[PDB]
Amino acid sequence: MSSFSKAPQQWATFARVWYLLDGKMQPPGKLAAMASVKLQGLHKPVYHQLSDCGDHVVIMNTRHIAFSGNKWEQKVYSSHTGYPGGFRQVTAAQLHQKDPVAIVKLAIYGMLPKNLHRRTMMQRLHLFPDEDIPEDILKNLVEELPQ
Amino acid sequence: KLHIVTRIKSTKRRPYWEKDIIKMLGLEKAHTPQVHKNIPSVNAKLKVVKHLIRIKPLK
């Protein structure tokens, strides 16, 4: 083919590939790392920062996640409002008993770089406490990497 | 035999007399090797700045 005068290689953009990640005892935040790698598209040799070539990751069985140590009761999630004394402390236990899909999502929410692309790639992430996937009627690729 | 002196560390932040020693060894730059004869006069100065340099015997 042809190449001219010192240029980086990117053509236009491509289509993202949807991936599936299993639950059941994989460490929280340890999965969020590689899920953020797949979210950014760092696993693809064609990766570009501005192009946002990141894929769409779907994880299942988020309630079956297992955190080691005593961190179950000892982890405190802080939620503060505009009102004075609106500081709220929610333990990982109670949060798991209420809204588990939030936990892992938060573990991902700190991994990604800031500003736009964070929320942009955040919309590419979906979590469910139990397995129901109408999106599985649509054939997708499954990747298995347990810890 | 003959000893070759190489500068692996800066003379900056160090006393001026050490810089004078390095100038005596003929090192104007880091990592630059210099061939020198073995004598107590040179060996002493070599022992002064030894912590700032690496010396290897050759030839």
Binding site: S2, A15, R16, V17, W18, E135, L138, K139, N140, L141 | -
Partner: protein, 272 residues
């Protein structure tokens, strides 16, 4: 002095809102003579002969008609430039014919496995007006071209270019021409467009014709797998085979487009 710079700035600022048309006679700053141009033309290119035919090659009928028109209008004197056009049209005629023959020989020798339809298509694309005229303008032939009305329009530069061709055919013979043209045209193509304009109508059916003509085997399309995406485009994996042997495989957004691309890749695959 500030007056000369204010006048230069005012002229340079006046040329922004006013654009004058390009003139052929006032184009070159130095005096333009026939011998100077043909001399440089002889020094640059390998071999150049028939200076009269070369000068005639850059002569167009419009300039002659305009000249004779001015001769009739003013009525001062009368001269005959008539022979120029009559000598040019013949060179152009032979030029076109020999160009067709030469290019046909090129496509015949280079790609023997290319079907007649492909040969016709590639010849039609290679002899196309727009491309050749583009090569002309890129070679700055318009500077050597003589046109009274306007320098720009393609019917001038194209006929002029073909006249130059025929001139090289008569003067320098075929052996030199084959060196000249063959170098440029190939370098100009560079694209997939060559087989794309022939694929504009029923790619599948064309592949059917080629396969039935060569191996006498009906092509079969079979979906080997599907990876769906509801948001942007779904991806279907389409295989294309003959006699259980897979010819090609490829992804597509829709079944139609997938089959089109598969048929295209398979089309260029059988080109060799």
């Amino acid at each position: 002095x500030x007056x000369x710079x204010x006048x230069x700035x005012x002229x340079x600022x006046x040329x922004x809102x006013x654009x004058x048309x390009x003139x052929x006679x006032x184009x070159x700053x130095x005096x333009x003579d026939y011998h100077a141009e043909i001399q440089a033309f002889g020094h640059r290119l390998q071999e150049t002969f028939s200076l009269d035919l070369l000068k005639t090659a850059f002569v167009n009928s419009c300039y002659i008609k305009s000249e004779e028109a001015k001769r009739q209008k003013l009525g001062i004197d009368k001269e005959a430039a008539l022979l120029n056009l009559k000598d040019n049209q013949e060179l152009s005629e032979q030029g076109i014919s020999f160009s067709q023959t030469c290019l046909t020989q090129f496509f015949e020798d280079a790609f023997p496995d290319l079907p007649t339809e492909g040969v016709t298509s590639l010849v039609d694309f290679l002899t196309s007006e727009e491309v050749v005229c583009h090569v002309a303008r890129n070679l700055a032939v318009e500077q050597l071209a003589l046109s009274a009305e306007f320098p720009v329009p393609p019917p001038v530069l194209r006929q002029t270019f073909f006249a130059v061709i025929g001139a090289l055919l008569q003067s320098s013979g075929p052996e030199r021409t084959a060196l000249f043209i063959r170098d440029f045209l190939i370098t100009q193509m560079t694209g997939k467009e060559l087989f794309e304009m022939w694929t504009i109508t029923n790619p599948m059916g064309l592949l059917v014709e080629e396969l039935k003509k060569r191996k006498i085997s009906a092509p079969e399309s079979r979906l080997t797998r599907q990876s769906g995406s509801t948001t942007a485009l779904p991806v279907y994996f389409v295989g294309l085979y003959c006699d259980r042997k897979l010819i090609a495989e490829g992804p597509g957004e829709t079944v139609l487009v997938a089959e089109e691309e598969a048929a295209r890749v398979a089309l260029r695959k059988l080109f060799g």
